[PDB]
Amino acid sequence: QQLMMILNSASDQPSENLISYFNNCTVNPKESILKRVKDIGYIFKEKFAKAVGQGCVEIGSQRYKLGVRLYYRVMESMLKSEEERLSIQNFSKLLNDNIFHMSLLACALEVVMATYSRSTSQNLDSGTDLSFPWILNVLNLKAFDFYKVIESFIKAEGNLTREMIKHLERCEHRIMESLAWLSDSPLFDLIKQSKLVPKSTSLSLFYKKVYRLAYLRLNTLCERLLSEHPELEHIIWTLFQHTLQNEYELMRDRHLDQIMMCSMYGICKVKNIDLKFKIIVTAYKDLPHAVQETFKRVLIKEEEYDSIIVFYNSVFMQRLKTNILQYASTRPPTLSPIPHIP
């Protein structure tokens, strides 16, 4: 409640302290910042009304206002954290970056929407869902660009409720597990970039997170399904990890967990160990946020969708067969480092 309290009594302007940071910029960002806030406001309000109906436009307008107040607040908190850490205070390049601002604003708004859109005024007659990632489509922001701001947003805002931190974490796993891998995602550019040269701190840090989430799920399923065969987890993890890293195309418009399950099946197959898809899939929906659609509606060719089994045999295999054979070969691939968890 406290954060909502603060935001309601806060001004619509950037504080004086915050102004000081714009002044200490080589190119003062203040103009571009306010212009952006102004422009995005028209768009947000337009999309909000479209979803909600003709009623009282004051509601949407206040949600944007609160969003912008959180935005300014967290921005100043971030600039203080960075001034304290690196004892620098000319953040001209950061404060002028369009994507930085769009991400911060997007996130601020998502907190305000999620705290308020917890109301039964929810199943809109319009048909549109205000829930994440609705905000991303409104602001026309790529899920990957949004993911980058979440960790810093949490650190910068100590008044987030446990539930809201939890919700932002869940937004982050959704970017990592599927959303950042949608067709137009700038993620693929960064990957192809890294293919030509051995240069991306953010990509490797993104990948580091993806691995933590991936292995943590692999682990859960292995301790349940493959107790009898304790050695399989590291081998399956090597296949999984190799697929994310070198057959990344398989992730396009698909889901991290689809790759996870085909890797378990695939390795058990070449190891002549009996673990059928039904057993894998059955244990899978016991996982926290698992949904049937993930194994019953998998992208195959173009607009075709089918079960994970059809995906395994008609797409996954045609692509990974040779690498899969290496695990039961005279010289098997060296095992990939297991991610650190708790």
From Swiss-Prot:
Tissues in which the UniProt entry reports expression: Expressed in the retina. Expressed in foreskin keratinocytes (at protein level).
Cellular localization per UniProt: Nucleus; Cytoplasm
Segments traversing the membrane: none
Residues with PTM Phosphoserine: S185, S336
Entry remark concerning the domains of this protein: The Pocket domain binds to the threonine-phosphorylated domain C, thereby preventing interaction with heterodimeric E2F/DP transcription factor complexes.
UniProt family annotation: Belongs to the retinoblastoma protein (RB) family.
Protein name (database record): Retinoblastoma-associated protein
Section of the entire sequence shown: 383 to 783 of 928
